[PDB]
């Protein structure tokens, strides 16, 4: 039994047909390179991936989502202990400068994109439960907050490519379980699955960045923070940003009504808290500036 | 279409054959009058609450898991602001001390369930993902700590009706959508399904003790906490306390998979959120010492 | 020069005519022995004190306000040192039981005043601004809540008789203004002209009770809560609680609009902070609880 | 009726004779480009404003009261959200970055002048109250201590030009009367009677900045802190830096001194407040430390 | 070897001639049935403790020293989490009710005296250090605060026996161990060689109240909070209280002094640390208020 | 009498022998240009030094003992109130540039050293309790953790005299002993024995820097954070690092082992303190970035 199982969902390598093109739509109209784990592990049931990716498309796609997404990542610092720099440790390792910038070019397109995920994963959520997620301000966006931002991913950025789990060598499943367990999650985010093939990295950020404050209040309540600055912002779309269960019982059986319900909670925590993880790993390189920064999309 | 739907479940009502057996033996190994939301959705799904209830059953009618509940119970107060006892606002609504006695005995059999529930909840949701909920301590329990408590619910102890909210006044469901979304929960919990057939004290008790602290990080301080004190706790167990997803793969879809740990996930905070809230209202009856007092099992 | 002076006041023997009938109608319209020294003083201008009380009053002398004192009074304790009781230092000192309880009985008065007294001064400083003190809410108040109090001081309460500080001596004029000057006041608050007979006991209370917390995070967030309270109460209030000054220029000069106005914030301020002290005070004979109950209308 | 009414005061273009020669003498000896709305309110009263100016001048023109007041700056930042830079917003409405820079230097100046206006304020406070304000130290001032600044306002400075409310837009009148209302504040402060020139900044700078923040405890604190910073200070000057009320009682009515009491009070309030507001603005811009940077008397 | 050593010291028993008398003074001027480890171990030095205690019995012999101990006393409980109360546990495992009020005596004698050997150690170290313990103050003590509380131990009240660790039995050394490095300590308090007759109650102890703080913020925080009450405190003492190394080179060799100035700073902490501890043992049982209560010299 | 004695200790130009290899020992693992005064003055003790110096010195000169203390300094930074920048004070006074960077220097030399010494007297400390100070970690250091960092003091570094307190200036004994008292320390830190021949920098440090955090929540927060990264990181060493005291029976004296088990705990708390004090002081000239990297051994 190996360490890490890989967990259901219908990997980016899966996904076919429409769902294919709704994995795609999220990756250009996001300017993300990949489907956030939740997306791909909610995708396995019918509809709501694509339903509610359709309410949300033309409300995530705004500049004002993308400066909610922002006051995410702005918001994302965790006032707990000083890291040191893991550039020196890397270097020890006999990592190459360009080795390291490709990990924090890494670490800084998933900081880009998982604040935009705690909005669709807040808008999916709260939508859900037929709280708002838009549609209610009397006011609908004006100015540029209306307009859309970049289709497609930023230039210079390829998808990523999510390690497979099951190949991964014992080193990299333990340190993706260990990140896993160290915040009760129930699988190691996407971001792993890319970071995963720098497991000397990932063990490093683990005890030096992840660690020292997984579970504690302080992470808790910088996720609380965020995950409030998504659902209040999800408030100014000018239409529902997602769907409500209670539409989708043609489409989904009780049983998939709950799976998701959980699921959608979950990854509402999930996302929250990876993105917070990653900034933090970024934190470690440079500061919170630089880890917070929109570097994609301005 | 009404204010509140009904969550996909099988209600205490609906459970046939062996997991009618299991609900009963949920009610009487846990002593309490009402089989857990989070159990009843979960329930809806073959094999995990049977197979992960008789792995948590033996480990939790231990004293030993009665004191992590007592742990739970006592440190469920919320640090928040000072509330009015809702006692003179009943009367005003012209309730007699018997009614205001029945609702504080629903409270407190409430406050007695929820963390048994919670340590429930976590057992599951951590034996679900391999974590720690037993078996590995260097010494099995002993003593007190290894005696089972009573089984069946306490003396004078029946089991509570949950209202049937399709049935339910427009009053009450609104104040159970209400406490449900000022915490971004996904359904009420069976405690208001008890407690909302006076939904003219649940509008007191969203108003004076709910409201003001949902969201807050005093709440979710809290509910860290007490998450925290019943995950170390079922650490304590001889033996497992629920099953591991991966060894469920025969009995469960990779869908179902994904659904159940979601809803784990999602119980093990919404146990512990309501855990809070309902000490939190009789807390405002009494204080803080009576609602965290274990009354029944002692 | 004595180190205290009269702050310049309609003090309650001095009221006249009208303004006579307003301050006897404050004192039993709130069943309060004094009238608090914001509005002597703010009743040296003409015409506001009258017109803002008489928006006050329909308002304030509801069940409703007065849960909204209440709520004010229970969250008015300061998460501060613990404080040593007086009652062996009085006593030490040949204070009699009789006397010590008549101390007692003044703070009891005096928490139970000044509670409503901060509901009344947010009232009149957020009317004063046209902020909401009222008539706003779509629900008019329902049931009880809209009752009157009783009208008149509780039984066996008499009017305070505050002392006359040009005639106080130099210990208890000293007290007032160490007490005036640890919390930056302006002047002894009431409560502290009804104490200051006692100058013994002020000074204990000083040394025990009020400096160690004043002007610190805790008292001033205590404030700040209390000050909250009574903001947010106020806007439950069925029509407006006091009167705008832009609704006052043929009433009061523009020299008169601007005192008031400070004095309606200082006083705002004031009152909380008073409230808090008084309560303290009490709490340390007594414990949180005694200190902050309502003792009198319920 | 208009959204906003114009508050009470000798605005700059009213002060005639000695009391313009007094408004000149705080532009230059303060080196800013406003007279403080607390002292053209404060101006309407007979006497004080001179009779305060006159003490605190030899005071606050030395280096020592700059030393304060920088440390005033230093210390007004909030530890509250993270604020998205306005920059990219102010360029999406068309600015140029030339218009842009106007906006950050008028908030320059205006975080240099309120802490220096918060030692003015907490100067006359406390002396108003007989509380220590200079004179009491063991040591005069010495050394670089008690230099004086230079007199008049920095090169390239012009006094600000504060709109005149009444004829100002409904958009500007609104933005005023919203940024007043958020922190319970009796008028805009000069601050946005310069800056509402550009409502369209000051609804973002409300939004983003100062709406997040009003009235909670951080914001309340940095005030504590920074009012503590300053009344602490004034006790190192080497003589009373204002009036007592009790030495101005042939020169005020015992109205006036109730009514400038309550202003004094106030304005100690409110000019911290703006203090920090205005540096919050800046800080959103470019950070603490550039926001609470002396950029003008160094 | 075992597990525990005996901590170099001249234990109750082997006091000969004054030291003596000088620990039985201890006993009766403090009204406690042990001399404290502090002492015990300072004691072996040539001196210091028999001088030390003769500067500062005078002064901890009055009511004001007695009030200053019960300030610390008050303010000792830990804003930890809350604690089960171990009766049912030393219930089950069979005590008796005579057997655990003696252990409930044991702790309220423990918390009598630990609050006053806090003062003792302040005055001791701040006195070494030249500090203020007394004598400077403007007053001298009059009234109430100069008498001398009744010398002796309490009626009822018979010294303690501390056990001999090295006769004690492995589970007793371990628990004293634990117990020991849980705080980072250096040795067993006296307290514990009190209570570890019973170490089935101290491993209860150490699980259910102490090890859940040990170290941590609140707990340290504590401890700052009454070694600050104990510091000011000792500065309203009429003369000095301890003696200054300074005045002790005579007396004692550089190497003492140095060895002294070490075991004063470490007992300060020391005593804080074990104040704290058995109070919130007690408070186990009881709560706060008994916990912290003066239950001896009133 | 003078302001302040010279605390015994073996001073720098005292050490003789193997005991002056030891201290050049020190200064060379640790590339430190002074021995620290908690060495200073436990090298007055037979073996002890000399002993616990060949435990800790093949730990503490390796990569992961410098990752160590580059933790603890980088955890240094109390989050206290903003500092004024000293610079302009100190060239109003006539510094020149050049002095003002030696001083910096200084600060920068001893902000290098005080977070080692954090780590030496912490291993010390727990090895002399035999808490865990290496040897028991399961895995050994590997990778470049287990290397040698550069022996001897960097380039461009001299050791430094510390002045000598008898025959300074009484400004540099008060200040000194103002420091040393402010936080409650036994004697000045070598740190204030090389800063101290600029008494007037010291002096504004004390006001500007330490003064107002000393003894406060934030401070000994800081500390007890760093004092907890210092004890958890020696776990990590591949041997124990210091000697326990039971094993030092038969070389040093039960009074030695009291006095040594003294200073160790109070040098444990003081070089906390002093990192953390001589951190800020840089800090004030530059920012915590700055004074808190490691300038040294990279």
Known sequence: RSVLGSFPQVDHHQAKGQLAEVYDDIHNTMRVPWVAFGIRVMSQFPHFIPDAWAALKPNIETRYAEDGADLIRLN?????????????????????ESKIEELKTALDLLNYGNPKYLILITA???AWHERDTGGRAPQKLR???????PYGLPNSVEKFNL?????ASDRTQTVLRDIRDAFLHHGPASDYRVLGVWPD????????????????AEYDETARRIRKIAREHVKGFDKPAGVAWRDMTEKLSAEQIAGLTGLLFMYNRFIADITIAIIRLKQAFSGPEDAT???YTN
């Open 76 to 96: 994302s610092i965790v006032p707990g202990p000083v890291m040191p720099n893991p550039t020196p440790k890397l270097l020890r390792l006999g990592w190459t």
């Open 143 to 149: 100015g540029r907050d209306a307009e859309r931002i």
């Open 201 to 216: 990295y990932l063990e490093i950020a683990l005890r030096d960045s992840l660690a020292p404050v997984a579970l504690s």
């Open 293 to 295: 920064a929109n570097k």
């Open 163 to 167: 390690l497979d789990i099951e190949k």
């Open 124 to 126: 999916f959520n709260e």
